[PDB]
Write a structure and sequence with these properties.
By secondary structure, the protein is mainly α. Helices cover about 35% and strands about 0% of the residues. The protein binds one RNA strand through helix 1 and helix 2. One of its GO terms (cellular component) is cytosolic small ribosomal subunit.
Length: about 60
RNA sequence: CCUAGGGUAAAACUGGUAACUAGGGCUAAGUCGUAACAAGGUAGCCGUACCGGAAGGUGCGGCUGGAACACCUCCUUUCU
């Protein structure tokens, strides 16, 4: 129930990795709540805006299944 | 020359009164409806706009000074 970004030394969230951005998304392409992943709020905001940036850049789908 | 008094002109303050007219408090509790008090039978109230014999109704925003119900779809992590 810890933060995978506070445990490691990662300070940025890249959006050009569709394979890496699949760990914070639902099975149908929805952002997972930070309660299930233990991520702090400061990094949850960043991962949410990164997911949205990937959706805009057409690396992750809006409506998936 | 000065100045009491008198005349004249336009204003300011204030009192009384007036056809008609708006609202307020009581009287015997007359006529019409039941708007609020229980979730008052459409939750209530506040600001505002429109409308209607009347209490009032509706649109937008805000509050609980409202009752009854009221824990969860994903289970766990590697420098991307």
């Amino acid at each position: 129930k810890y933060c995978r970004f506070k445990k490691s030394g990662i300070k940025y969230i890249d959006y050009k990795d569709a394979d890496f951005l699949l760990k914070f998304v639902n099975e149908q392409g929805k952002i997972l709540p930070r309660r299930l992943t233990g991520t702090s709020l400061k990094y949850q905001r960043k991962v949410s805006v990164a997911v949205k940036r990937a959706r805009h850049l057409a690396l992750m789908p809006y409506v998936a299944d």
